[PDB]
Design a protein around this ligand. Sequence first.
Ligand code: COH
Ligand code: WAA
Length: 454
Amino acid sequence: IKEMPQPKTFGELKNLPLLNTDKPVQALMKIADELGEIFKFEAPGRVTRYLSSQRLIKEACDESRFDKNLSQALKFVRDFAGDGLFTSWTHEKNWKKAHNILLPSFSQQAMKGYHAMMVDIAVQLVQKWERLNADEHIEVPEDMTRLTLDTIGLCGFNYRFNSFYRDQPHPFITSMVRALDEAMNKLQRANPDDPAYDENKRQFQEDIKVMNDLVDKIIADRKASGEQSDDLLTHMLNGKDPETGEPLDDENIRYQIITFLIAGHETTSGLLSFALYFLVKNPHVLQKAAEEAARVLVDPVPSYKQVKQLKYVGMVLNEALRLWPTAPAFSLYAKEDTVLGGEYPLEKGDELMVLIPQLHRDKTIWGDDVEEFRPERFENPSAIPQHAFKPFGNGQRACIGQQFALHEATLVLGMMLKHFDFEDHTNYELDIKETLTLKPEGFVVKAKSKKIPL
Ligand code: COH
Ligand SMILES: CC(C)C1=CC2=CC[C@@H]3[C@](C)(CCC[C@@]3(C)C(=O)N[C@@H](Cc3c[nH]c4ccccc34)C(=O)O)[C@H]2CC1
């Protein structure tokens, strides 16, 4: 039975001021480097424990002992993602109902059906870049977000945000981003009911209304038409949970759509942005991935099968997920009194935070080179111990979108590497901006066309 380390305290505010920062995940990583595999974090009226080691996270991932907790971050997002899959408790009837209905819509097999719509958006990204003039550069996170948002819009509910036709996001996106920013800011806001925050609350309600209005209208229009499409909204209007025999109601479908649109934004586009960052910083790795793309993508437009045979591109994406997982933490609660790692007694209800970027730098798993970008780490995945690699979270509460996110990312990166040579023309210095997600802020490149027609 061991005493848990704790970072520096601030009198009555305990550890709370350590998260008064624009880069809290990066701050928590530096604390874990100091204190090790577990530390207690106290604030007025709360305590959580940050885990960093495969040794302890493997136990945290035991679903008989720990279930998904809603972090305060998830509680603030629930104000507009409701009881969709991401912001629901496991015990809420709408979680297991939506999970049973949606799982078949998100399988590897279902990706054959979305492939043509994903190609639509990937081809718009390639044409944009083919159409840049000689002096011009690419705003990498900006264009990856254009693609990932439009891909989930079109595959989700046959809706075109037409992001590649715009400088200003679509109205829905400006409201969604400002709602997400507001939810994230409330984490650091003392005395939120202070009348100084009156204007935030009125703006928050307006943005929730914008989102509900557009999504409720797309649902009503689809039901009003009877159209059957290749999209999640068809699967949700038609589907019945085999357990309860019930369908989702229109309110819950709205929450699922809002949830997928949150995910399909900078959380997916972050993976592509980090991947391209690592590739331009590791020209030998970029060359190997470009060689695979030229070898495999022999057709004007890539096939589902051809994306599956981009094995080294998939390893590149897993290595980017290792170093900078774009959904960098998740929360758990103890189902019963239990002892973590033979050393740390927990009571029923006690919270754990999994610090994924820190798990992914466990030298006992990965060896001494943990800071190196080496996709070849992933050549034999059977060698990876249980729960060592967790960018999509854990168990029944793992990312439902994982096969979607990886198919889109492998397709797009494949096509980028087939069509263009890349230049790190600014010698970009990595600056990771933390919102809901992580991104390489200001990451810019030049793309020189290889002049291969679509
Ligand atoms: C279109 C939908 C979609 C996409 C593209 C997507 C793409 C990605 C993505 C891209 C690289 C990453 C790193 C993640 C990472 C995660 N996703 Co998603 N997710 C998506 C839909 C979801 C949903 C829905 C959940 C909740 C699943 C559940 O609990 O039933 C989810 C859960 C997660 C969790 C668990 C959170 C927790 O609190 O435990 C992580 C981590 N993620 N996701
Ligand atoms: C919505 C999804 C995509 C997200 C999940 C997250 C999980 C953990 C979060 C998060 C990374 C944002 C920064 C704080 C952090 C690390 C956290 O521990 N947060 C704890 C502890 C905490 C911080 N501030 C608080 C204020 C009140 C209560 C708890 C807290 C929490 O939210 O619960 C955040 C990103 C957004």
